[PDB]
Amino acid sequence: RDRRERRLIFGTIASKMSLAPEADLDSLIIRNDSLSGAVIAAIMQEAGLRAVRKNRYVILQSDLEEAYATQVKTDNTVDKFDFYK
Amino acid sequence: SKLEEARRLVNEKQYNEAEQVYLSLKRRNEQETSILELGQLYVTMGAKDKLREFIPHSTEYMMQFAKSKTVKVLKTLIEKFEQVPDSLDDQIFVCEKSIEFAKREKRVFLKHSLSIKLATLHYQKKQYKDSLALINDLLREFKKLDDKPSLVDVHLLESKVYHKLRNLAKSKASLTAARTAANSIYCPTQTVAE
Amino acid sequence: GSRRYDSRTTIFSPEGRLYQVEYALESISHAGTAIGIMASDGIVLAAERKVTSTLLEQDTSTEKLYKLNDKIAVAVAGLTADAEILINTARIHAQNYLKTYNEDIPVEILVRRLSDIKQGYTQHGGLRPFGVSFIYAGYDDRYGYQLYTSNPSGNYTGWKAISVGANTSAAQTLLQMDYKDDMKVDDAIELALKTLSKTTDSSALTYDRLEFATIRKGANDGEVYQKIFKPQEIKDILVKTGIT
Amino acid sequence: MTDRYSFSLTTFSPSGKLGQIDYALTAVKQGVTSLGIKATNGVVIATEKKSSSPLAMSETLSKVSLLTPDIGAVYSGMGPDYRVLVDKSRKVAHTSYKRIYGEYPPTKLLVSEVAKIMQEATQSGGVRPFGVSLLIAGHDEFNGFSLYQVDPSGSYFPWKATAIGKGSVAAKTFLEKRWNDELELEDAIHIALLTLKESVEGEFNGDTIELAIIGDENPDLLGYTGIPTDKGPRFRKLTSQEINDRLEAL
Amino acid sequence: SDPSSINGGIVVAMTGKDCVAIACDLRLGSQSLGVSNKFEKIFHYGHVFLGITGLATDVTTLNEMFRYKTNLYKLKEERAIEPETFTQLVSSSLYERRFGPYFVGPVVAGINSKSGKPFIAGFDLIGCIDEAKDFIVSGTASDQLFGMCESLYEPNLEPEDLFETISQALLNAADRDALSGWGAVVYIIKKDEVVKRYLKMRQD
Amino acid sequence: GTGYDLSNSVFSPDGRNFQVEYAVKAVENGTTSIGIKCNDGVVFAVEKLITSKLLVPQKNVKIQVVDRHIGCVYSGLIPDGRHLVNRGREEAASFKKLYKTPIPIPAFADRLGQYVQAHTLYNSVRPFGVSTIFGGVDKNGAHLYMLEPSGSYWGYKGAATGKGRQSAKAELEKLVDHHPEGLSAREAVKQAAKIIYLAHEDNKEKDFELEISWCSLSETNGLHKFVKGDLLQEAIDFAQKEI
Amino acid sequence: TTIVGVKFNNGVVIAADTRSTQGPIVADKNCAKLHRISPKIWCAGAGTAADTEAVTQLIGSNIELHSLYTSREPRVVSALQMLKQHLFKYQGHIGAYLIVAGVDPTGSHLFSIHAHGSTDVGYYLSLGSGSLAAMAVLESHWKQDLTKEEAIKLASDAIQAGIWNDLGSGSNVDVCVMEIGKDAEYLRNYLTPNVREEKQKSYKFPRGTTAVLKESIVNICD
Amino acid sequence: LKKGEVSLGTSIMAVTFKDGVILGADSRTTTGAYIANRVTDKLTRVHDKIWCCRSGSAADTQAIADIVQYHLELYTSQYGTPSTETAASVFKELCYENKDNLTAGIIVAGYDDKNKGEVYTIPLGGSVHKLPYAIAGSGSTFIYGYCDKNFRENMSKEETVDFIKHSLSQAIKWDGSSGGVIRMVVLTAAGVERLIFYPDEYEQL
Amino acid sequence: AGYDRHITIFSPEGRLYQVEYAFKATNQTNINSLAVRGKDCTVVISQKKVPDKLLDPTTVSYIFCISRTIGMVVNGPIPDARNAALRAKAEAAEFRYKYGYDMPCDVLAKRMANLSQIYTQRAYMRPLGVILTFVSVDEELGPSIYKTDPAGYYVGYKATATGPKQQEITTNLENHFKKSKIDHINEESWEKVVEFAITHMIDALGTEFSKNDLEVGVATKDKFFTLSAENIEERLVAIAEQD
């Protein structure tokens, strides 16, 4: 859940891949979730697949933003009911 | 109009009239931004005595229109003074006036925060004895008042001062204490790098 | 059908006692302890507030001792929220008595009114009984000083010395040995302080968590002086009792 | 027809503790982590607005409200319950004091009067206890500044500094060293901002923090000039622009 | 036709430097017949003094009701009731009923426990508020008291001088009412104590 | 936990009220009853089942009338619909008393739906077990609404409830498709008789009896009355002709 | 009792005297007849002096509660309707004669409410027993597109005519002006045409002039 | 009619024609001997296409108009668009039971796309009637000679306004209780238009 | 015991189970709707699903005009929606009568949320089964969209989604709102916002609409109305020819 840990691991995964220069992972990690050390790699895999679908061979920020919406939506629990808090 | 004219005077390096343009100076935000730009111009010409008169009189000027935005402008003005070199005495004098003002208004947080800055300025001046005394006082204050984010910095400065005094054992002890306080908080990357 | 969700609060058990008041008498034991000593010269009411911390306000804070009339004061042991309504009703009844007779209400009348209020809920209405027990202290020209106690059941008896709340048995056993029939106010006060020291769950006795209410009669006759001991005077008796 | 639930829904457990009360306490201890601390010249009550969906408007939702121009309210439980509570409390405060005495009741009596409603809710049959915990801050010309915390059981305690919510344990255990006998309003607001910094889990800015202050009688917000008797409402609430100025003062 | 003036009554209130003077007559007469000279029309409510003039039954009922209200207020706030609150409470209390309102001329006199400045106010049968910094008087003979008080009252009088001023403003006008007399009582409010004094009147 | 169907206001885990569903299932065990929305008005129809011949013919009726222009035909728990139409008549009477205008059909629908749902909010009231095909003619035209025990009503162009509910709706669809431009009341009554006969084939074991009624402007000028005389026999033997 | 109100372009202004009369005799010389419903809306009562303050207190409490409930500023229209309903439900048994003036984001407004519930609206309006003299003057002098100083001068002239030509009106002049752009300000003793002169002789008496039947002291504090 | 309470009186009149109905009134409110407001309005908009005028006690008329507004808005919100007879119905039902307390005369007139314009009048007793034209108020007691002879059916807008001014001139001049400006409302298929006259012109003929 | 889940009582996790199950009842109709906020007006568009051909399309709609200025779109079972519509209309009536001025959208939303909260707190009552979206233009505040819930948690929205695919439409609109940084659509004409909403809805659901699949409600300055089928067809034709 620490911002520094997610930043470190996101950078580690991004370094091997082909992130575009105009793509910010800090914009992806603005919100503090319970993101695991594995989902935050499958999200980048999904972003890469999304970029490949649009024939782009280098992933952009617009695909990283969409990847967050498809691999991490909710844990359900009670956040689906706002009136509890 | 006035702000654009002052920026133009800056672009022509004739900000010597933008000085009076700002002196003449939602309007609360305009006033605070004009104060910040005038301080930046003062740094640009680097007239140390000019900034020394500028900062405290601006803080007193601050307690007439905006009131709330005093800590922010004071901190950014002091940090802007760091750019201007050959200002050890001037920066120390400005910090002394600011600490007197903080005592006057009983803003304990600003006084504690400003004291560690004055200790750093003393350390840069290489006045090790008075810096050590002030830093011991700050250590006493921050020990009971548990403020690990500031305790890390004061202990690091103490280790620097002790290293400059060649008392290596006490410097190592201070560094180890800072390490103890460091690895329990959200200490920023600057202080962990230091 | 609105039946399966009913708990049948006013129901007789197979052996023959109520069950809700039975558990109210357990809820009483989990609240802060209170002590009441009947002395010849006056009445001392003391209680130890529960859940105490450095951030608890003590300057103007009374949660166990409440004033119902200039002569009559009560001690609360239990749920303060439920005690508030009873306190308000008691004050209303006392002021109505002053309306009707223009004379100070005797303690027994108010004690009966509150006991009846509790019994009415323990009898009908299907509502949970009040989980609070009171300690009544007051003065009059009828019987002099009076020291009753209340229960969620709504029964009251007179007592020369009572302690309702946590560790009731220990406090009663401690006080019964040292209780005589001739103490002044100070002897009763020091006895109560020693009892509280020996019954508390903490280690020391700091002035923050102790409350004192005393009834004194001096030069003026016919009117007693009701003083709720503030912390500044509370810390004074600690050194007199030797606990400090 | 009417209401067939005339029986009390709160029944004493055999262990000697109220069910619904100890259940509402659990419902309170989870949720928004709010706090409020009392200083010498004023009282600051702060809470964070958890924006549920980023398409919503936290401006429309009022996490803090005005019971009286002197007394404000902050909660940490369920939204609608707090809203109904605040409306009812305003109504009964008006009825009890503005109609009969002619002015605004002090904090001490208003807190007891509002807690009357909740301690009746746990008693009157067919209804459930309120799932909120109220932080009441107020000032009066005799008892001065005072802050009160109201628990769903109906019990209210005077506290110099407090916090209720998910981060209640950390904030409560962190406020002792922060707090001392003498304090200033800006000192108090800086203390509150520092305490709330770690307890927030979302974006940190002026929009996500709801902050109100009870201070001196400011006449600008009074809405009229000419009466020396009154000098304005003591309860003021910072906007996003106001709070994002001391936010970087850390 | 007018039950308020059947039993008779007068009242006078003065203001001064940290001092307030309130005086009343001790006579209670029924229509043409006098009954008792022990009836006092001023009652002690904390540090606030309230006097009632008019129907005697209304006087005692209002006395008890106000004592009840201030007793509840004192038990709630753990201290006395400021006269500024007291006057508004009295004004609101009379407005509970409209068709059968009490026929009283009450006046509330007291000193604030914090500011210390003198406070005094009056009302009417219905309960219309009336606050003046000079003097408020009431009763069946109020016309007699008003002119005499205007002639005699000077602002900022010495506290001992208020007693003589109110005595002259009351006695020489008390004899001008058939239902007033049988002596009088004068109350002087001071921050330390209250001076209770009687006055001598011809019996007629 | 179990017992989610014991009470009324309780919500099931999937969010569906259960007593209302059981009321719906009780509705289907009732006599079939159809209604056709012809161009000018509406045409109701019922299939009151003839029990042992002791029952008197042509006397027991099920098409209740509200005011003059609203008709009610009900299936399922017949008494429950009796009470529902009684309350509806009271509402129409109140409206005509304090507005002096005959109640429009959608307003009557709103009133009846609000009454029906008032009985599926509490724990101390059983939901209605009657489905109605109430309709009629008003100033703006003609309307035919089916009400369901859940409280949901819709502006149908034709509806039917009962044992032969499913069979009746198929012939309703066939009639609607055959005449997209519209349908006259005179042919609508014969079509309604035919539809009822087709639906009754499921209950051929027991004897049948047909009663029909229609509200229209062309002939009845906004008045509701049954079908008597040669018209009913003509509809009957026309519908029996194709059989 | 004379109360007037004048509506000008930017806002509205009302005025009142300070003499409270219970009949042939005057009770108090300096009183505040202007009642505050909200910081932006003001009311002044006439007719009976005993229903005005109670009714205005009721309406002020309820209106401020409603504004807090709606989390928005109060509106003069809502207050006017609420006065209308309250006065009507008593069926003409309350003789309260009130003026209502206020501004809102919709604009500025000024109405009058009668004892039995009647309502009216006008740029100039004077209500009460002494309203006649002032209302004649304002009908004589009023015109379109008034200014703030012109409006207050017209109100002062109207109240001066009322106090000079009527017995029950006099002493000081109390004026409240409502400004759309700025805050509404309240003037206390704006005009004081009547000032009591010093007495020829001082009626101070020597000490002990009146005999005392008995001396006693009553306790106050514990 | 109580003693001292504010009453309207004056005259109110509405005339139907081809394109709709034109309803008229004055601006004078005479309270006993005095005239309180001379620029007031006697016209109440209970609905956009349904209009009502007030006569009798001012407070009673205003209260009944507010109640009718509430009921009519309820009707248009839930059931459907209103009509003239419904507007008269709510007025009659409001006035009937409380006739001991409430005593006022009301005239309602509205335009619709089906039955064109209709005028319904409520006398003091509370009955309802449909008439091509109707008058109410104390000032209306004098024009009975003029309007009845000069009334025509299916007139036009210009002739209708000409008749309305030529009828209200005598009402204003012959009775002092009626005066001030003359207010006109036009209800047609195009919409509702507000027309106001001035004292200095209709008097000059 | 186990009677916790049946009535609105707290749970070992501190939850109100009945209110939680009430939300699952709002998706029974699986009708997806969204409302955007224009520069000066508001438009709300909802899917119009007609199950059977016997339905009259005109009468079946989940959009109710509360008053001449306030419109409302409700998702969930219709009978409870109609109950809520009746109460909302009656309360708008009462407020307009008592205060004399048309009420803003937020006040109505807060009052309905308070009513729902009273429903939840009282045990003998059951919570409303609907989710109401109040939409209007406030001259005092501006265009506004307000969405309540069965619990009573109401809050203004820049743009509201609902239905089974509420999350997907929410992200689809959020990408646009976070890229354009504006709190409302910059289109001045109510014509353009309708096509904007329809285009985004089509791209979100992945479906193509006809004259009858969707019903659009438009709230301009001091005016609310529901567009007819021809209007929706013209809008769809304009969208098709434009893109």
PDB file of C-alpha atoms in Angstrom, chain E residues 23-185:
ATOM      1  CA  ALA E  23     -39.594  49.580  45.279  1.00  0.00           C
ATOM      2  CA  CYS E  24     -43.133  48.336  45.833  1.00  0.00           C
ATOM      3  CA  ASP E  25     -46.121  48.877  48.101  1.00  0.00           C
ATOM      4  CA  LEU E  26     -47.176  46.364  50.749  1.00  0.00           C
ATOM      5  CA  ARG E  27     -50.936  46.972  50.479  1.00  0.00           C
ATOM      6  CA  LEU E  28     -53.369  44.436  49.037  1.00  0.00           C
ATOM      7  CA  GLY E  29     -56.941  45.699  48.838  1.00  0.00           C
ATOM      8  CA  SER E  30     -59.974  44.033  47.279  1.00  0.00           C
ATOM      9  CA  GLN E  31     -62.095  46.490  45.257  1.00  0.00           C
ATOM     10  CA  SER E  32     -63.130  49.057  47.893  1.00  0.00           C
ATOM     11  CA  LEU E  33     -61.854  47.035  50.883  1.00  0.00           C
ATOM     12  CA  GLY E  34     -58.273  46.638  52.043  1.00  0.00           C
ATOM     13  CA  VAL E  35     -57.218  43.195  53.206  1.00  0.00           C
ATOM     14  CA  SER E  36     -53.558  42.771  54.141  1.00  0.00           C
ATOM     15  CA  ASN E  37     -50.406  44.860  54.445  1.00  0.00           C
ATOM     16  CA  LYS E  38     -48.030  41.864  54.533  1.00  0.00           C
ATOM     17  CA  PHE E  39     -48.312  41.120  50.802  1.00  0.00           C
ATOM     18  CA  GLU E  40     -44.989  41.713  49.047  1.00  0.00           C
ATOM     19  CA  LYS E  41     -44.940  41.972  45.255  1.00  0.00           C
ATOM     20  CA  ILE E  42     -41.183  41.474  44.716  1.00  0.00           C
ATOM     21  CA  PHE E  43     -39.546  38.043  44.679  1.00  0.00           C
ATOM     22  CA  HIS E  44     -35.912  36.926  44.728  1.00  0.00           C
ATOM     23  CA  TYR E  45     -34.720  34.851  41.749  1.00  0.00           C
ATOM     24  CA  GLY E  46     -30.955  34.510  42.030  1.00  0.00           C
ATOM     25  CA  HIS E  47     -29.461  37.963  41.542  1.00  0.00           C
ATOM     26  CA  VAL E  48     -32.467  39.088  39.455  1.00  0.00           C
ATOM     27  CA  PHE E  49     -35.431  40.759  41.159  1.00  0.00           C
ATOM     28  CA  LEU E  50     -38.897  40.615  39.600  1.00  0.00           C
ATOM     29  CA  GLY E  51     -41.974  42.542  40.709  1.00  0.00           C
ATOM     30  CA  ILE E  52     -45.575  41.827  39.716  1.00  0.00           C
ATOM     31  CA  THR E  53     -48.438  44.329  39.831  1.00  0.00           C
ATOM     32  CA  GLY E  54     -52.069  43.546  39.084  1.00  0.00           C
ATOM     33  CA  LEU E  55     -54.334  40.646  40.011  1.00  0.00           C
ATOM     34  CA  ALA E  56     -53.029  38.926  43.139  1.00  0.00           C
ATOM     35  CA  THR E  57     -53.811  35.392  41.951  1.00  0.00           C
ATOM     36  CA  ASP E  58     -52.013  36.181  38.696  1.00  0.00           C
ATOM     37  CA  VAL E  59     -49.153  37.576  40.794  1.00  0.00           C
ATOM     38  CA  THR E  60     -48.667  34.384  42.801  1.00  0.00           C
ATOM     39  CA  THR E  61     -49.188  32.057  39.823  1.00  0.00           C
ATOM     40  CA  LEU E  62     -46.587  33.945  37.786  1.00  0.00           C
ATOM     41  CA  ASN E  63     -44.263  34.004  40.800  1.00  0.00           C
ATOM     42  CA  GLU E  64     -44.422  30.227  41.095  1.00  0.00           C
ATOM     43  CA  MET E  65     -44.135  29.598  37.349  1.00  0.00           C
ATOM     44  CA  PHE E  66     -41.091  31.853  37.019  1.00  0.00           C
ATOM     45  CA  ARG E  67     -39.509  30.278  40.101  1.00  0.00           C
ATOM     46  CA  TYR E  68     -40.038  26.889  38.438  1.00  0.00           C
ATOM     47  CA  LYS E  69     -38.466  28.027  35.159  1.00  0.00           C
ATOM     48  CA  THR E  70     -35.419  29.641  36.772  1.00  0.00           C
ATOM     49  CA  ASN E  71     -34.949  26.647  39.078  1.00  0.00           C
ATOM     50  CA  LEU E  72     -34.805  24.393  36.020  1.00  0.00           C
ATOM     51  CA  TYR E  73     -32.442  26.819  34.274  1.00  0.00           C
ATOM     52  CA  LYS E  74     -30.170  27.023  37.328  1.00  0.00           C
ATOM     53  CA  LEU E  75     -30.071  23.237  37.656  1.00  0.00           C
ATOM     54  CA  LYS E  76     -29.229  22.930  33.950  1.00  0.00           C
ATOM     55  CA  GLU E  77     -26.541  25.631  33.725  1.00  0.00           C
ATOM     56  CA  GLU E  78     -25.273  25.051  37.311  1.00  0.00           C
ATOM     57  CA  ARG E  79     -25.501  28.815  37.950  1.00  0.00           C
ATOM     58  CA  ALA E  80     -27.959  31.702  38.138  1.00  0.00           C
ATOM     59  CA  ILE E  81     -29.945  33.284  35.295  1.00  0.00           C
ATOM     60  CA  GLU E  82     -28.798  36.529  33.695  1.00  0.00           C
ATOM     61  CA  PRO E  83     -31.524  39.225  33.673  1.00  0.00           C
ATOM     62  CA  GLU E  84     -31.146  39.674  29.904  1.00  0.00           C
ATOM     63  CA  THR E  85     -32.326  36.082  29.526  1.00  0.00           C
ATOM     64  CA  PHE E  86     -34.905  36.598  32.285  1.00  0.00           C
ATOM     65  CA  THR E  87     -36.782  39.429  30.566  1.00  0.00           C
ATOM     66  CA  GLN E  88     -37.114  37.510  27.299  1.00  0.00           C
ATOM     67  CA  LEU E  89     -38.210  34.402  29.210  1.00  0.00           C
ATOM     68  CA  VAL E  90     -40.924  36.457  30.920  1.00  0.00           C
ATOM     69  CA  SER E  91     -41.991  37.939  27.580  1.00  0.00           C
ATOM     70  CA  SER E  92     -42.266  34.477  26.016  1.00  0.00           C
ATOM     71  CA  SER E  93     -44.021  32.970  29.049  1.00  0.00           C
ATOM     72  CA  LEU E  94     -46.958  35.394  28.909  1.00  0.00           C
ATOM     73  CA  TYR E  95     -47.537  34.607  25.214  1.00  0.00           C
ATOM     74  CA  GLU E  96     -48.511  30.974  25.857  1.00  0.00           C
ATOM     75  CA  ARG E  97     -52.196  31.967  25.923  1.00  0.00           C
ATOM     76  CA  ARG E  98     -53.977  34.837  24.175  1.00  0.00           C
ATOM     77  CA  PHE E  99     -57.691  34.611  24.992  1.00  0.00           C
ATOM     78  CA  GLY E 100     -57.166  34.280  28.753  1.00  0.00           C
ATOM     79  CA  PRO E 101     -53.893  36.119  29.375  1.00  0.00           C
ATOM     80  CA  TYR E 102     -52.677  37.094  32.820  1.00  0.00           C
ATOM     81  CA  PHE E 103     -53.435  40.690  33.827  1.00  0.00           C
ATOM     82  CA  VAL E 104     -50.034  41.715  35.202  1.00  0.00           C
ATOM     83  CA  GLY E 105     -47.608  44.608  34.917  1.00  0.00           C
ATOM     84  CA  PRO E 106     -44.368  42.813  35.739  1.00  0.00           C
ATOM     85  CA  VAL E 107     -40.923  44.417  35.725  1.00  0.00           C
ATOM     86  CA  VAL E 108     -37.549  42.648  35.884  1.00  0.00           C
ATOM     87  CA  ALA E 109     -34.607  44.346  37.610  1.00  0.00           C
ATOM     88  CA  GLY E 110     -31.093  42.982  37.933  1.00  0.00           C
ATOM     89  CA  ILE E 111     -27.404  43.373  37.187  1.00  0.00           C
ATOM     90  CA  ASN E 112     -25.400  41.238  34.771  1.00  0.00           C
ATOM     91  CA  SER E 113     -22.920  38.977  36.550  1.00  0.00           C
ATOM     92  CA  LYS E 114     -20.218  39.582  33.906  1.00  0.00           C
ATOM     93  CA  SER E 115     -20.575  43.099  32.483  1.00  0.00           C
ATOM     94  CA  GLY E 116     -21.940  44.512  35.745  1.00  0.00           C
ATOM     95  CA  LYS E 117     -23.942  47.270  34.063  1.00  0.00           C
ATOM     96  CA  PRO E 118     -27.454  47.869  35.433  1.00  0.00           C
ATOM     97  CA  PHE E 119     -30.362  46.276  33.592  1.00  0.00           C
ATOM     98  CA  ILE E 120     -34.077  46.969  33.902  1.00  0.00           C
ATOM     99  CA  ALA E 121     -37.110  46.271  31.716  1.00  0.00           C
ATOM    100  CA  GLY E 122     -40.891  46.123  31.865  1.00  0.00           C
ATOM    101  CA  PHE E 123     -43.846  44.524  30.111  1.00  0.00           C
ATOM    102  CA  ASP E 124     -47.622  44.889  29.827  1.00  0.00           C
ATOM    103  CA  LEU E 125     -50.690  42.667  30.228  1.00  0.00           C
ATOM    104  CA  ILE E 126     -50.041  40.756  26.998  1.00  0.00           C
ATOM    105  CA  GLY E 127     -46.261  40.799  27.407  1.00  0.00           C
ATOM    106  CA  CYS E 128     -44.970  43.514  25.089  1.00  0.00           C
ATOM    107  CA  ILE E 129     -41.281  44.130  25.738  1.00  0.00           C
ATOM    108  CA  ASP E 130     -40.195  47.522  27.092  1.00  0.00           C
ATOM    109  CA  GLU E 131     -36.518  48.272  27.757  1.00  0.00           C
ATOM    110  CA  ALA E 132     -35.349  51.755  28.732  1.00  0.00           C
ATOM    111  CA  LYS E 133     -32.097  52.915  30.299  1.00  0.00           C
ATOM    112  CA  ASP E 134     -33.838  55.484  32.535  1.00  0.00           C
ATOM    113  CA  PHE E 135     -36.721  53.821  34.399  1.00  0.00           C
ATOM    114  CA  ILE E 136     -39.697  51.541  33.880  1.00  0.00           C
ATOM    115  CA  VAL E 137     -42.645  51.626  36.286  1.00  0.00           C
ATOM    116  CA  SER E 138     -46.014  49.892  36.242  1.00  0.00           C
ATOM    117  CA  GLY E 139     -49.254  49.462  38.156  1.00  0.00           C
ATOM    118  CA  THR E 140     -52.726  50.953  38.292  1.00  0.00           C
ATOM    119  CA  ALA E 141     -51.251  54.385  39.097  1.00  0.00           C
ATOM    120  CA  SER E 142     -48.508  54.389  36.436  1.00  0.00           C
ATOM    121  CA  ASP E 143     -49.649  57.795  35.171  1.00  0.00           C
ATOM    122  CA  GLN E 144     -48.864  59.271  38.593  1.00  0.00           C
ATOM    123  CA  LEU E 145     -45.422  57.640  38.736  1.00  0.00           C
ATOM    124  CA  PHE E 146     -44.360  58.577  35.191  1.00  0.00           C
ATOM    125  CA  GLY E 147     -44.538  62.361  35.520  1.00  0.00           C
ATOM    126  CA  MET E 148     -43.069  62.425  39.022  1.00  0.00           C
ATOM    127  CA  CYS E 149     -40.197  60.157  37.966  1.00  0.00           C
ATOM    128  CA  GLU E 150     -39.484  62.342  34.935  1.00  0.00           C
ATOM    129  CA  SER E 151     -39.439  65.411  37.189  1.00  0.00           C
ATOM    130  CA  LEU E 152     -37.241  63.758  39.827  1.00  0.00           C
ATOM    131  CA  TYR E 153     -34.950  61.365  37.935  1.00  0.00           C
ATOM    132  CA  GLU E 154     -31.518  62.618  36.922  1.00  0.00           C
ATOM    133  CA  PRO E 155     -29.099  60.222  35.184  1.00  0.00           C
ATOM    134  CA  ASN E 156     -25.943  58.933  36.889  1.00  0.00           C
ATOM    135  CA  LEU E 157     -26.931  59.279  40.539  1.00  0.00           C
ATOM    136  CA  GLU E 158     -24.893  58.142  43.527  1.00  0.00           C
ATOM    137  CA  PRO E 159     -26.097  54.714  44.762  1.00  0.00           C
ATOM    138  CA  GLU E 160     -27.175  56.090  48.143  1.00  0.00           C
ATOM    139  CA  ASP E 161     -28.982  58.908  46.312  1.00  0.00           C
ATOM    140  CA  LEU E 162     -31.138  56.466  44.326  1.00  0.00           C
ATOM    141  CA  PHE E 163     -32.844  55.418  47.563  1.00  0.00           C
ATOM    142  CA  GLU E 164     -33.973  58.953  48.389  1.00  0.00           C
ATOM    143  CA  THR E 165     -34.843  59.661  44.750  1.00  0.00           C
ATOM    144  CA  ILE E 166     -37.057  56.575  44.475  1.00  0.00           C
ATOM    145  CA  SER E 167     -38.586  57.269  47.899  1.00  0.00           C
ATOM    146  CA  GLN E 168     -39.661  60.733  46.766  1.00  0.00           C
ATOM    147  CA  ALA E 169     -40.757  59.371  43.374  1.00  0.00           C
ATOM    148  CA  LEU E 170     -42.882  56.684  45.069  1.00  0.00           C
ATOM    149  CA  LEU E 171     -44.371  57.988  48.326  1.00  0.00           C
ATOM    150  CA  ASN E 172     -45.694  61.317  47.033  1.00  0.00           C
ATOM    151  CA  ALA E 173     -47.371  59.407  44.183  1.00  0.00           C
ATOM    152  CA  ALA E 174     -48.412  56.373  46.245  1.00  0.00           C
ATOM    153  CA  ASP E 175     -50.818  58.510  48.287  1.00  0.00           C
ATOM    154  CA  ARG E 176     -52.424  59.618  45.003  1.00  0.00           C
ATOM    155  CA  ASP E 177     -53.788  56.078  44.493  1.00  0.00           C
ATOM    156  CA  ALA E 178     -56.585  54.748  46.691  1.00  0.00           C
ATOM    157  CA  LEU E 179     -55.425  51.130  46.292  1.00  0.00           C
ATOM    158  CA  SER E 180     -51.790  51.869  47.231  1.00  0.00           C
ATOM    159  CA  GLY E 181     -50.339  52.534  50.661  1.00  0.00           C
ATOM    160  CA  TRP E 182     -49.912  50.646  53.934  1.00  0.00           C
ATOM    161  CA  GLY E 183     -46.165  51.199  53.777  1.00  0.00           C
ATOM    162  CA  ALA E 184     -43.667  50.259  51.103  1.00  0.00           C
ATOM    163  CA  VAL E 185     -40.461  48.282  50.603  1.00  0.00           C
TER     164      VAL E 185
END
